[PDB]
Design a protein around this nucleic acid. Structure first.
Ligand SMILES: [Mg+2]
Ligand SMILES: [Mg+2]
Ligand SMILES: [Mg+2]
Ligand SMILES: [Mg+2]
Ligand SMILES: [Mg+2]
Ligand SMILES: [Mg+2]
Ligand SMILES: [Mg+2]
Ligand SMILES: [Mg+2]
Ligand SMILES: [Mg+2]
Ligand SMILES: [Mg+2]
Ligand SMILES: [Mg+2]
Ligand SMILES: [Mg+2]
Ligand SMILES: [Mg+2]
Ligand SMILES: [Mg+2]
Ligand SMILES: [Mg+2]
Ligand SMILES: [Mg+2]
Ligand SMILES: [Mg+2]
Ligand SMILES: [Mg+2]
Ligand SMILES: [Mg+2]
Ligand SMILES: [Mg+2]
Ligand SMILES: [Mg+2]
Ligand SMILES: [Mg+2]
Ligand SMILES: [Mg+2]
Ligand SMILES: [Mg+2]
Ligand SMILES: [Mg+2]
Ligand SMILES: [Mg+2]
Ligand SMILES: [Mg+2]
Ligand SMILES: [Mg+2]
Ligand SMILES: [Mg+2]
Ligand SMILES: [Mg+2]
Ligand SMILES: [Mg+2]
Ligand SMILES: [Mg+2]
Ligand SMILES: [Mg+2]
Ligand SMILES: [Mg+2]
Ligand SMILES: [Mg+2]
Ligand SMILES: [Mg+2]
Ligand SMILES: [Mg+2]
Ligand SMILES: [Mg+2]
Ligand SMILES: [Mg+2]
Ligand SMILES: [Mg+2]
Ligand SMILES: [Mg+2]
Ligand SMILES: [Mg+2]
Ligand SMILES: [Mg+2]
Ligand SMILES: [Mg+2]
Ligand SMILES: [Mg+2]
Ligand SMILES: [Zn+2]
Lengths: 117, 213, 112, 51, 109, 169
RNA sequence: ACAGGUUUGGUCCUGGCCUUUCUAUUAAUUCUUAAUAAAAUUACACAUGCAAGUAUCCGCGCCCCGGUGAGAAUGCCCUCCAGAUCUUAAAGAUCAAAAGGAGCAGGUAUCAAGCACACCUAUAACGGUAGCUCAUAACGCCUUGCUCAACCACACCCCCACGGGAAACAGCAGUGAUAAAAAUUAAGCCAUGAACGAAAGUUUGACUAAGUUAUAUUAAUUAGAGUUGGUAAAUCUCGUGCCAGCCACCGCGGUCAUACGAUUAACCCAAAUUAAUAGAUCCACGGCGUAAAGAGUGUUUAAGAAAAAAAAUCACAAUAGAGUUAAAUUA
RNA sequence: UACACAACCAUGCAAGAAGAGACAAGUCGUAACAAGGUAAGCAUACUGGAAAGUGUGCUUGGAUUACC
């Protein structure tokens, strides 16, 4: 529909199943609904691991870099998937979250060590 | 769209003219528009409360026009700085006032709009720009005997690498793209950083209308 | 070369209906439309206003219309390019001789 | 190229048409040579009757 | 009909179903105005229990009370359906057994 | 169908089997033929048979027939550039007109292949969505991934109710 | 449609109605637990709670998501795009208003005429032509969201919203009235989308995870409903006696009722089974002497077929005028 | 600022008028079906409690039984 503003954004459309998510990485308007109209579907992300224990992430890089060079904004999970794939640099939020997880482990090991004695 | 039985809606077009007349006739003056209740931190005009992080700089500092109303020619050619700039940027960042237009409706004369020349981190811009965030309570005035001392800045070169290695997958994309064409060159691909210079969040953005060329 | 027309009918061939308007010809363009049920093509007519700056086309002329780059009015969006067949005065485009229906007015075997 | 080829085929068919029209013209002259001698007989009998 | 006539007339479309006595609704809640007895047509012979009711749409219609024996007086709220009785001419509604004021058929004890 | 002389020419197969695709320049086709004489028999059979086959695959090209106007049958193509392509037909047969028109102004097999090869690109096999545009709707139906809880119930350790019941205690 | 029942003493043909198939709502009877999907009477009026915030002030967003189908035959599809937004030096990309049109597009012609709906000059003023649409359906009337990754329209009403009624849930929950129609006045932003901020981060009745509901499917922890004359699977004994009553059509009941009510038995479905109402499907590429249909006749317009060649015109009561009377009858 | 302003229509009710149809047993005739006892019917006009009768043309959806 006609909008007053908005911008092209590569995001994840949560079109899936109950207790079973499945994201469609699409490039849509920022004023459009999540599962609504889009311009062109890029890829697909399966959050749940399959029988082989792999989270299937599918990226159409040839259209992703085209829309990025045309001016498409990116979301935080999209940049996270690109950083995990290696098409984009690793996100500072992923780096700091891994550091925080390491600090939580470093606190829990000392707590479990001081609990036994 | 275009139909033979469309109706000539005149009220919708009359209300546009009425609202456009009201916008300029009942245009709120900036003196009462930027007013502030220093006890509850609430704007009397709009009705919004200031953020929690701005409560100290309102009660302990002053704004630009509040220290510019006590100047002979409203500070022509004078330099004004900001507390946040003096706190974060060790480099001299000031504003060379070229023209000031205060609001005459104010009873204390502490509001107005001005233009000037911006020198952020020593870099002097040779274009005239309107000064931004005048109603902010962070402006500070530098005396006359320090006008030459505060401007003393050492132009030092930057140490940012001019070329950065590509991400792994994108680098392998070029390593496999140029290989199929018969290019035996094993040179490492680099990513340019010249046109990727970005200004920090403290850099004020222009307010003038951008002209399409 | 910035001269475009938003209409779909870039070039059309039709018959002249009326010439009562000054410097304007009323052309009836007939196309073939498929019947969704009978699967047969039937003749669908359509009225097109054309500008005749010379006022030369009469009722019954098979005329070609070209899309005007800008519509002069809300009804005149075409212009007369060439009168393909004048009523009663037909020139055979293959032999170049005047013909009256099926009979030749001047036989092409007599050059002189 | 295709437009020039079409023009050449049109001119070839035009020459064949001219030859056919000349043959039909001669056949028409033969028909005139039959109808003139029939009408010359049919004319004089009516004039003799009216005389 | 030739092809030109069939193209000029278009393909035949089926007509929409005309609304019956229930105005397209499955059921209708109406108040019983008068309970009486009607007689069937020529071959059959009986005394059918009917009632004139005022439907929720404001229309006053005749319905037929099925089953053997009923306790229905005036000012009784019943639910009628579009069941048409074959023996009674003009009666095209039937009272639903097991509703507000029309209980089920009781067994003779 | 049953009504008509040749009922076969009023079917989707006969209209789809005609391989004549004009170029993007062709706009108008004026066919001028006669209804008498043994010469215009091929043009009359062309108007009777192949005109619907050309008009089916060229819906935007105007086609206009004129009867008993000129002594010689002909075609006249009006292109977008303004060029008028005059075609003479006096003793040509029905098939010769089709092959001559496809030779002068048509689309080659190499031209017709790439258009459908580019149209095929629109439907991507890796995309997901409705059955009208894509091949798969719920990623659950992939043989390796997690089944579709509308078909196979999920285990107890994976449901959000059990997760919020563990988070409660 | 692979069809079947039904017109009559009987047969054939034409011809309508009903049955057999699938789906949705409501009602009745019955009912055990889970998972998934969906929650649908109301454009009638709303108590109460929440649903737009972010931020070193400015600013940016604030029917965007979400809701509804009242109006509009609205519209589907296709060109051109002003304008808005994102990154850049320009240029690019998204939404795309308005202007239109190859074509398509509900019923009704018992809506047949509309009544100014057109054109040229050169300027954005005067003037002159007498036009324009329409049986290929104009102009009217009635009904309706839709062709669905979606699109269109509305936001209390006066089509609009300066102004006037007048204090607005067609946001999430809930409440009155109404109706055959009955989800929680519940928890969170952990995941995604959106808004803000340079950012850690915040908000979000969108959404996520739950609660209720046999509306639908599946698994089993569950067994009741309908029917038993023909169509159409399946009945034994009693009671009534054209009464009570039954039926979708044929029809059954007046003294041995396999058709009513009860019992036995049997058949088909099954946590569902029937009833009602809506649907999907279904009329004519068939016919016109006797069943409905050849319009009382000829000519012409629009429109259509000219697909191979031939022909036009002769006794007798056509018709329109003027004149006359053999038989009979009568003043 | 100067004019028409419920004129025009839609939804219900209506004193009343008229028609059609259904409803197993009424009164008065016997019109049609058999040359239905005057052969039927069409258009039209008049008349009559009623079916109907008659006049002028028309049709056989009637016969004239066929060396009569
Ligand atoms: Mg869901
Ligand atoms: Mg019944
Ligand atoms: Mg009950
Ligand atoms: Mg009968
Ligand atoms: Mg219910
Ligand atoms: Mg704010
Ligand atoms: Mg919506
Ligand atoms: Mg309307
Ligand atoms: Mg644009
Ligand atoms: Mg547009
Ligand atoms: Mg009428
Ligand atoms: Mg509606
Ligand atoms: Mg409004
Ligand atoms: Mg409301
Ligand atoms: Mg609201
Ligand atoms: Mg609500
Ligand atoms: Mg309530
Ligand atoms: Mg419900
Ligand atoms: Mg309730
Ligand atoms: Mg309830
Ligand atoms: Mg209840
Ligand atoms: Mg909450
Ligand atoms: Mg979130
Ligand atoms: Mg967050
Ligand atoms: Mg169920
Ligand atoms: Mg029964
Ligand atoms: Mg018995
Ligand atoms: Mg039965
Ligand atoms: Mg029984
Ligand atoms: Mg029929
Ligand atoms: Mg008949
Ligand atoms: Mg006749
Ligand atoms: Mg008649
Ligand atoms: Mg006379
Ligand atoms: Mg006398
Ligand atoms: Mg009689
Ligand atoms: Mg007799
Ligand atoms: Mg009689
Ligand atoms: Mg008698
Ligand atoms: Mg008689
Ligand atoms: Mg008789
Ligand atoms: Mg009569
Ligand atoms: Mg008489
Ligand atoms: Mg008499
Ligand atoms: Mg007879
Ligand atoms: Zn699934």
């Amino acid at each position: 529909r006609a909008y007053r503003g908005g911008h092209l954004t590569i995001r994840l459309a949560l079109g899936g199943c109950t207790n079973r998510p499945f994201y469609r990485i699409v490039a849509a308007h920022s004023k459009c609904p999540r599962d609504g109209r889009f311009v062109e579907q890029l890829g697909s992300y399966d959050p749940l691991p399959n029988s082989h224990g792999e989270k299937l992430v599918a990226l159409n890089f040839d259209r992703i870099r085209h829309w990025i060079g045309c001016g498409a904004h990116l979301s935080k999970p999209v940049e996270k998937l690109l950083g995990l794939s290696g098409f984009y640099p690793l996100h500072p939020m992923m780096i700091t979250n891994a550091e925080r997880l390491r600090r939580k482990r470093a606190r829990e090991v000392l707590l479990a060590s001081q609990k036994t004695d | 769209m275009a139909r033979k039985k469309v109706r000539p809606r005149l009220i919708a077009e009359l209300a546009r003219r009425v609202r456009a007349l009201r916008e300029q006739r009942e245009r709120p003056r900036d003196s009462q528009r930027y007013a502030l209740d220093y006890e509850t931190m609430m704007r009397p005009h709009s009705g919004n409360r200031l953020p929690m992080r701005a409560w100290a700089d309102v009660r302990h500092e002053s704004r630009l026009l509040q220290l510019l109303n006590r100047l002979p020619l409203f500070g022509l050619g004078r330099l004004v700085t900001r507390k946040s700039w003096l706190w974060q940027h060790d480099e001299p960042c000031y504003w060379r006032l070229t023209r000031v237009r205060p609001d005459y409706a104010a009873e204390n004369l502490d509001h107005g709009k001005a233009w000037g020349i911006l020198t952020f981190k020593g870099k002097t811009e040779s274009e005239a720009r309107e000064i931004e965030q005048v109603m902010y309570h962070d402006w500070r005035l530098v005396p006359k005997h320090e006008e030459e001392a505060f401007t003393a800045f050492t132009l030092v070169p930057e140490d940012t690498p001019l070329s950065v290695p590509y991400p792994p997958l994108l680098r392998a994309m070029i390593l496999a793209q140029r290989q199929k064409y018969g290019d035996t060159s094993t040179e490492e691909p680099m990513l340019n950083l010249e046109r990727a210079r970005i200004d920090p969040w403290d850099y004020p953005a222009k307010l003038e209308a951008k002209t399409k060329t | 070369s910035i001269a475009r027309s938003s209409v779909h009918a870039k070039w059309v061939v039709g018959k002249v209906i009326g010439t009562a308007m000054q410097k304007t010809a009323k052309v009836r363009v007939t196309r073939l439309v498929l019947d969704p049920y009978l699967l047969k093509y039937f003749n669908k007519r359509k009225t097109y206003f054309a500008h005749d700056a010379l006022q030369q086309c009469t009722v019954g002329d098979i005329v070609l219309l070209k899309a005007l780059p800008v519509p002069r009015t809300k009804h005149v969006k075409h212009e007369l390019a060439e009168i393909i067949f004048k009523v009663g005065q037909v020139i055979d485009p293959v032999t170049g001789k005047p013909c009256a229906g099926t009979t030749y007015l001047e036989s092409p075997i007599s050059p002189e | 190229e295709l437009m020039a080829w079409n023009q050449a085929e049109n001119q070839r068919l035009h020459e064949l048409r001219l030859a056919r029209l000349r043959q039909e013209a001669l056949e028409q002259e033969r028909r005139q040579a039959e109808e003139a001698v029939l009408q010359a007989r049919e004319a004089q009998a009516w004039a003799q009757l009216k005389e | 009909a030739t092809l030109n006539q069939m193209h000029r007339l278009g393909p035949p479309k089926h007509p929409p179903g005309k609304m019956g006595p229930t105005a397209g609704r499955p059921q209708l809640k109406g108040v019983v105005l008068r309970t009486f007895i009607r007689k069937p047509k020529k071959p059959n012979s009986a005394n059918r229990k009917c009632c004139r009711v005022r439907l929720s749409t404001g229309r006053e219609a005749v319905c037929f009370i099925p089953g053997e024996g009923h306790s229905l007086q005036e000012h009784h709220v019943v639910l009628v359906q579009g069941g048409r009785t074959q023996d009674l001419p003009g009666v095209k509604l039937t009272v639903v057994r097991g509703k507000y004021d029309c209980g089920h058929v009781q067994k003779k004890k | 169908p049953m009504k008509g002389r040749f009922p076969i020419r009023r079917t989707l197969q006969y209209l789809g089997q005609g391989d004549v695709v004009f170029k993007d320049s062709v706009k108008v086709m004026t066919v001028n033929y006669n209804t008498h004489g043994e010469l215009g028999e091929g043009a009359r059979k062309f108007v009777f048979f192949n005109i619907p086959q050309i008009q089916y695959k060229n819906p935007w090209v105007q086609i206009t027939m004129f009867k008993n106007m000129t002594p010689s049958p002909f075609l006249r193509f009006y292109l977008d550039s303004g060029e008028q392509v005059l075609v003479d037909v006096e003793s040509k047969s029905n098939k010769e007109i089709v092959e001559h028109i496809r030779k002068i102004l048509g689309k080659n097999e190499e031209t017709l292949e790439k258009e459908e090869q580019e149209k095929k690109q629109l439907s991507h096999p890796a995309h997901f969505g409705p059955r009208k545009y894509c091949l798969r709707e719920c990623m659950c139906e992939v043989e390796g991934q997690v089944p579709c809880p509308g078909l196979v119930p999920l285990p107890k350790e994976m449901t959000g109710k059990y997760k919020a019941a563990l988070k409660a205690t």
